[PDB]
Amino acid sequence: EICEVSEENYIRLKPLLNTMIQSNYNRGTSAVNVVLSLKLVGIQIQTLMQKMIQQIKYNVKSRLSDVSSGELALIILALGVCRNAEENLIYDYHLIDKLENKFQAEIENMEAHNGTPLTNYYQLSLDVLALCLFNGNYSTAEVVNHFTPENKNYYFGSQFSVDTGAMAVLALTCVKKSLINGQIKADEGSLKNISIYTKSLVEKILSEKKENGLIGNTFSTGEAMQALFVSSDYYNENDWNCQQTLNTVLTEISQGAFSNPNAAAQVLPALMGKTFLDINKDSSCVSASGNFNIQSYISVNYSVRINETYFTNVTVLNGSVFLSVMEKAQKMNDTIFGFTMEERSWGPYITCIQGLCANNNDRTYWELLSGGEPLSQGAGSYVVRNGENLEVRWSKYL
Ligand code: CNC
Ligand SMILES: *[C@@H]1O[C@H](CO)[C@@H](O)[C@H](O)[C@H]1NC(C)=O
Numbered sequence: 001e002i003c004e005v006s007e008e009n010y011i012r013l014k015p016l017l018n019t020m021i022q023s024n025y026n027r028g029t030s031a032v033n034v035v036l037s038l039k040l041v042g043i044q045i046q047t048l049m050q051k052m053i054q055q056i057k058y059n060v061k062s063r064l065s066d067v068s069s070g071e072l073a074l075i076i077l078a079l080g081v082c083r084n085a086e087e088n089l090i091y092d093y094h095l096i097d098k099l100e101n102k103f104q105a106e107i108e109n110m111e112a113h114n115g116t117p118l119t120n121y122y123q124l125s126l127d128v129l130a131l132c133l134f135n136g137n138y139s140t141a142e143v144v145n146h147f148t149p150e151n152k153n154y155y156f157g158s159q160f161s162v163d164t165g166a167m168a169v170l171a172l173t174c175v176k177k178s179l180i181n182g183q184i185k186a187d188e189g190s191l192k193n194i195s196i197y198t199k200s201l202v203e204k205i206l207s208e209k210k211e212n213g214l215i216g217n218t219f220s221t222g223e224a225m226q227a228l229f230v231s232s233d234y235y236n237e238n239d240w241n242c243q244q245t246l247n248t249v250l251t252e253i254s255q256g257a258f259s260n261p262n263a264a265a266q267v268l269p270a271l272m273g274k275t276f277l278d279i280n281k282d283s284s285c286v287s288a289s290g291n292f293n294i295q296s297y298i299s300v301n302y303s304v305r306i307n308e309t310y311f312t313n314v315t316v317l318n319g320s321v322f323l324s325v326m327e328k329a330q331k332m333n334d335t336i337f338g339f340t341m342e343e344r345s346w347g348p349y350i351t352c353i354q355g356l357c358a359n360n361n362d363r364t365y366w367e368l369l370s371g372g373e374p375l376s377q378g379a380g381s382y383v384v385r386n387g388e389n390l391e392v393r394w395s396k397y398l
């Protein structure tokens, strides 16, 4: 099923639009995902477009080797949503060729490191999707080999990653269409296995549907909708009410749930009935598209769990974020609560605590929890409440 915001309710999407516009003033956040999101729904924003090109030219000319496969995949997707002058950058910089190498590096890392890629399966799916949409060279056998729904990389602990599953579905679906067309040849029976993979992934995605229509959490729903949009083969009308899901998301937007530009970007296309598969590299660019009218303190139980657990009661100003709690604890005791964070596009990411740093190959990371439940937001955004059992936990992907 495909549902979308009616033209009468377009005003409800304004907070998303506003959020993405403010990201112009944030040099730490990406413009690639934002511009991709906008162009996908037929929206062009000059300032953000200029920001993205600047970021792309910067990374290509002096950091291309360090750019992750998934990051390059998004760059290619953003530059080639439709045919324009900026799309030439893909072929002038040979980004598709570079993506093939980065994608192969992910594969060779899994062979060397017990099945763990350099990044993750979300990016791996982004890689296949981009290579598929832009006629890049990739092995379908490699896809059949690694994208099996039972693969551990679809799961973070015991939790199936809806985001990962959704992006995989979008990628696998592209390969399917490419196979049925004349774009790509493969060993006969590949279409069958990929279809089965997709079938299983759709079931796992729908199994994470909440009572309110959300699929996974608030921030995985948008791309989950995309995946379900293109995979109606594997579910009935009574397996999913798209309208309920849409309505719940719209409610979240009005409550400011999508204040993070990365989250706003990822949710937008589906709300307009669009998916990543609507990317037509051979022209869809409508040049005329877009007319825009324009003290109190609180206390929590903060704990750091590794094997043993260190805990204190911290007091912060009301409306403080999870990160503020961590910083207060660090001041109380740098030995025990001292941490290392890095600035990401999503925001502040916790890499190390007590000199103990998260490791990709070890499949280890720091997990944020409240009352034993994993947060849906980062430390920099999660507003804490009185009497909350806040916890940062050393965890595995399992
Ligand atoms: C892989 C993945 C992803 N993750 Co994590 C999950 N699950 N994540 C991870 C892993 C990262 C390491 C790895 N192997 O890459 C992993 C398992 C450790 C992780 C952890 C976290 N994640 C978290 C969450 C909530 C999110 N994650 C997603 C970004 C969720 C993603 C889904 C999505 N994007 O919609 C996701 C599936 C794909 C990210 C990616 O590669 N994108 C493509 C890439 C090209 O862009 P990128 O921006 O460079 O991606 C990098 C960063 O995003 C960073 N990163 C990953 N997650 C976060 C979360 C935050 C808050 C920040 C600031 C950075 C990150 O890791 C990526 C590789 O370096 C999220 C959209 C999933 C969701 N629907 O809830 C959500 C963001 C929501 C929001 N409004 O903030 C955690 C806070 C969960 C928790 N309760 O502990 C936690 C961060 C704790 C900390 N230390 O600060
Ligand atoms: C498809 O999967 C089946 C069952 O695992 C396997 O026997 C077969 O070799 C696969 N076919 C292709 C072309 O991948």
Ligand SMILES: *[C@@H]1O[C@H](CO)[C@@H](O)[C@H](O)[C@H]1NC(C)=O
Binding pocket: 293, 294
């Ligand atoms: C544009 O925004 C202004 C804000 O004052 C509003 O009054 C006006 O009705 C809007 N114009 C339309 C209808 O697009």
Ligand SMILES: *[C@@H]1O[C@H](CO)[C@@H](O)[C@H](O)[C@H]1NC(C)=O
Binding pocket: 306, 307, 356, 394
């Ligand atoms: C946790 O304890 C185990 C012993 O059971 C130890 O081997 C391991 O190093 C500890 N974990 C960390 C993160 O050091």
Ligand SMILES: *[C@@H]1O[C@H](CO)[C@@H](O)[C@H](O)[C@H]1NC(C)=O
Binding pocket: 301, 302, 303, 304, 309, 310, 311, 389
């Ligand atoms: C706070 O966390 C500690 C462990 O870190 C635990 O012993 C204590 O019971 C917690 N406080 C409450 C009331 O939940």
Ligand SMILES: *[C@@H]1O[C@H](CO)[C@@H](O)[C@H](O)[C@H]1NC(C)=O
Binding pocket: 299, 313, 314, 315
């Ligand atoms: C935490 O709790 C203790 C005991 O109730 C209290 O005396 C102290 O003021 C609190 N400390 C902080 C930093 O909140």
Ligand SMILES: *[C@@H]1O[C@H](CO)[C@@H](O)[C@H](O)[C@H]1NC(C)=O
Binding pocket: 296, 318, 319, 386
């Ligand atoms: C702090 O502010 C929040 C909303 O801003 C409010 O819900 C909460 O009640 C306030 N502090 C109290 C009374 O615990």
Ligand SMILES: *[C@@H]1O[C@H](CO)[C@@H](O)[C@H](O)[C@H]1NC(C)=O
Binding pocket: 332, 333, 334, 335, 336
């Ligand atoms: C921090 O807490 C630990 C554990 O109670 C304590 O032994 C140590 O003296 C403290 N370190 C600092 C830097 O205050």
Ligand SMILES: [Ca+2]
Binding pocket: 334, 338, 339, 340
């Ligand atoms: Ca330190």
